[PDB]
Amino acid sequence: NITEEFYQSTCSAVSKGYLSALRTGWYTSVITIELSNIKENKCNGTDAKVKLIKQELDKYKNAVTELQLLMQFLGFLLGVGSAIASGVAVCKVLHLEGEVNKIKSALLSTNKAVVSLSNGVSVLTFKVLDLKNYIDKQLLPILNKQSCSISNIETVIEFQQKNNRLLEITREFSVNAGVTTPVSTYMLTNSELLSLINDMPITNDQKKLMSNNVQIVRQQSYSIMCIIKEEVLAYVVQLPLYGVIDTPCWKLHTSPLCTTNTKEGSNICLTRTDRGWYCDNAGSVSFFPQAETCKVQSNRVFCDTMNSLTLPSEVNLCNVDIFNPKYDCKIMTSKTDVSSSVITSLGAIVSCYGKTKCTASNKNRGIIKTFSNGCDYVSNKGVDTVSVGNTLYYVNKQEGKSLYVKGEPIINFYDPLVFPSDEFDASISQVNEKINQSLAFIRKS
């Protein structure tokens, strides 16, 4: 159930029918891998199987040494936060003398425990791998002797299975300076991530959504290497909590809009600079100017408030009547009359200024409709490919209904006489005052 409208007046398109999945806050969890305080062993035999585990154990001993070494459009309007601050905060909580013992004592006999830290926060805690119970109990007392013998070849292979995950965890942390994203299946397997979500202090609708899009729960999560103390290796996974769900969203698409004069440099240009994602949130509209930070799965839209503006709900009025009394819609000015196509959810915006040859094609027979010079639009219904100049555009073959909103292009309402052509961030009531300053004042003189 997806719909889309295009405004012939403003060279812009709105795509309604998308559901919200906003990331309001973060949740922190503490992953642990119990380790093995082990030194240079004593057995120096030449048995083929022994030299295999002797070098495999050095992979464990050096992987620990490596982590130990670590611990010694309007994006200019957006704010600046520290995404991993919540996880780094929990990390420094784990430094305090006694905080690591609480985790091991609560993980002494179970592989999952709810620990209340010093600062009065309950964090889900996970013990993920038993290398200590295998190396200390079955492997170390043989190597730390003079001569040592390995029973089975299958023991070597079984060791490689156990040691592999720890090496691949170290591999990511060594290459990402202790902070990795998206959180790989090594830092958290689907079985572990889903058991986290089901036991997070969150809503049953909140778990329903996370479970269906774990591939997007991963891209919006961080894993932070924290401490390796005593015989414990703990790294914090910072999972998102979605506090605004199932509200209606809509995506605005904008392209340059110029006059249609034939002579060079005789054209004035205007472009709507409020494109991006919009979703209803507590009576206001959260505007994400960077649509790249939002991720679209089917009709669900996962965004991060860190890349949002909290705007009044009057911004929605900027679609029907652009001027209006309530909200002052934002626009940029220029004189660059260059053709460019923008692909929307159910179509593609066509701006064909100049000598550019712009057309819309079908896979049975291309170039079914031709565009005159100006900013026009055609639905994806029946159209497969679109060409503007030397750039061929493939239109989204997603189904849905289209609606063409007709109107006179707004650029014809402006006198190109003293039209300010270098207003990067301005607005309509600011453009009209930019008119009166060069209209009224020059008239009186």
């Epitope: 079955q138 007392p141 043989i142 730390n144 002797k145 013998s149 390995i150 023991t155």
Partner: antibody, heavy 124, light 109 residues
Amino acid sequence: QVQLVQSGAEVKKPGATVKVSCKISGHTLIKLSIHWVRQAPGKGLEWMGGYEGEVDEIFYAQKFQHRLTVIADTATDTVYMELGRLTSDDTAVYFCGTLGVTVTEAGLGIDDYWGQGTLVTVSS
Amino acid sequence: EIVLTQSPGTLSLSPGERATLSCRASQIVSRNHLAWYQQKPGQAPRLLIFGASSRATGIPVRFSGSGSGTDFTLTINGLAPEDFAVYYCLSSDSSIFTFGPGTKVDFKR
């Protein structure tokens, strides 16, 4: 460079009690197995008793359990054997040796460290 | 109690020949807990083969162990002159050690 150095030769009179030492250098007693093995002149090897450092337990063969004591001093890495009511049948060379074998599921390991022996001649 | 017997008493062979030394138990002994020791006159015992077939650190490849249950076999595949001494087998059941009578490897004349 592990080295096990025993006490010197002893001469004891019938019915006496002999103390033989085994001092450990280059290694720790709590990770070692230390057992006493004696060899009468021209005869085979005979195990008497020992101490397993990993478990901190002392074992005795039933033939000598009534008159043999083994002591483990972890602070000085020294193990003693104390054998009383000696007879001419006890005239032998006494060795301390790491006989213990530790077995786990991945495999099994052993130490092979020995002293130099201690001669005990028992006659009146 | 476990009573270990070895055979033959004296094994007479020349360097380059194969030595085959037996050790047999009155009751089943654990394969992990049977070892082969070498003792030359005047010296302390020396471990050759532990855990039935495993070889000790720094023992030549010519020494090989085998055996299970009650019958065990130390095999020297090509005797060297330093190998002519006494070879004892050693079993252990619940940390109770018992030594074999001893097999002596002799110079064949």
